[PDB]
Amino acid sequence: IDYKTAFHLAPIGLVLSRDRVIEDCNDELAAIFRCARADLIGRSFEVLYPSSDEFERIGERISPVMIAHGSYADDRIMKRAGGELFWCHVTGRALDRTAPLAAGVWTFEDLSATRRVA
Template sequence: MDDIARIAFDHAPVGIVMTRHRVIEQCNTTFCDLSGYASAALLGQSFRMLYGSEAEFNQIRDIGLEPLRRAGAYADERMLRHAQGHAIWCRFRARTLTPQDPLARIVMSFAPIAPRSDGPALTARERQVVTWLARGKTSKEIAQVLGLSPRTIEDVRARLMRKFDVRNTGLLLARLSDLGQ
């Protein structure tokens, strides 16, 4: 990469990562800043280090695999684990360079989602639950993925509906989308 291209890559307004079979081969400075890791700590490492559990890491893979195979691209919102242990809510986009084997070579971007001041703030747990609700998961399925009881998920869901003054999950997701949460 020439100097100008490297500068553009490193200082892009979004974190950019290139992986081979979910192992980080390249990442820009913006991604390092977002994740809290130095480049040397990320390169050659499995993306697993950025997720809370092995189950979450595999679930994320399974959700995006078919769209990558079919369309060559996939996007969602997700939580990444920062080097200091807290979760970061991000807009995620991926494009495979090898649709026949989608995970063989992927370029990804990550943009942090900052909470807006014109609506209630979400806790880390609420963001996790909303992420899975937006993917069409039931409380029981979310509980299994997060290693919690279905009752805990129902409590979080009820708290979210009270917080945003809505009466069902569809309205909750629409309201959150309107607020940019």
């Protein structure tokens, strides 16, 4: 498996971002948000949040954690295409921690399904 194939095959949603815009993403991200990849490419993350205020609020929460630690993870409520609200675990690392919301790699996982415990 090469790196491009891994990105597209990954069982979690992946995004290559820049300034809170999705520059590339995989099919899993599309699945989570109930749309096509084409719907997400060049889309602001803002549309994935329950509201504009939420996008703003969580951005102000992301910055200092990302700067201070160099990575970020949380659980939050997000919005599927068509409006359904759901819980999503999100992780991210900025290419430069002092530019936390610039280029980075972000992960998304739907927490709707019951967690399998082995």
